[PDB]
């Protein structure tokens, strides 16, 4: 089979364009065994254009996928690595660093795609911490609703993320 890419619709925050969630492409663990340079190519074939990947180092040997950001690259997709700890979240400098390097992917009107593991908590979280940075009006709880619409009950995956989500803007608000 191919590769699913869900489009989430950004038009709750006056955004004309749709942003990409995914699990991990090539990933080869437990009855799963993917293709790593076919769902590469495929993307690709997509007009993938921006590619990033909250998965660490050590899970992307776990499923045997070592070189997933250099086939990326060998493939023409700009790709950013920014690692989330698996149920976790990223610090807000981090956090404020993907904010920024999504919207301009936006406003550059860049097919852009986000994934995990499983696509499921910490995408979600930067898809929904998204919709909070690019709305002053949306809610946490809002946010949460979109990307669960999109991703199932599961969407957001540990309190801790939750919890993130609910303060994200004071935190973010924190600048110095």
């Not at 045997?64 to 610090?91: E, M, S, W």
């Not at 696509?119 to 979109?146: F, H, K, M, N, W």
Request: net charge neutral.
């Amino acid at each position: 089979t191919p590769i699913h890419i869900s489009w989430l619709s950004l038009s709750r925050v006056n955004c004309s364009q749709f942003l990409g969630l995914c699990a991990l492409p090539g990933c080869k663990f437990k009855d799963v065994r993917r293709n790593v340079q076919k769902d590469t190519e495929e993307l690709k074939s997509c007009g993938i254009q921006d590619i990033f990947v909250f998965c660490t180092r050590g899970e992307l040997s776990k499923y045997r996928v070592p070189n997933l950001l250099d086939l990326y690259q060998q493939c023409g997709i700009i790709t950013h690595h920014h690692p989330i700890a698996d149920g976790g979240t990223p610090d807000i400098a981090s956090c404020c660093e993907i904010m920024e390097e999504l919207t301009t992917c936006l406003k550059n009107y860049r097919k852009t795609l986000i994934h995990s593991y499983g696509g499921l908590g910490r995408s979600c979280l930067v898809a929904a911490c998204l919709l909070l940075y690019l709305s002053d009006t949306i809610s946490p709880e809002q946010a949460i609703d979109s990307l669960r619409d999109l991703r199932g009950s599961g969407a957001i995956q540990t309190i801790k993320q939750y919890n993130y989500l609910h303060e994200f803007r004071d935190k973010l608000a924190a600048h110095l």
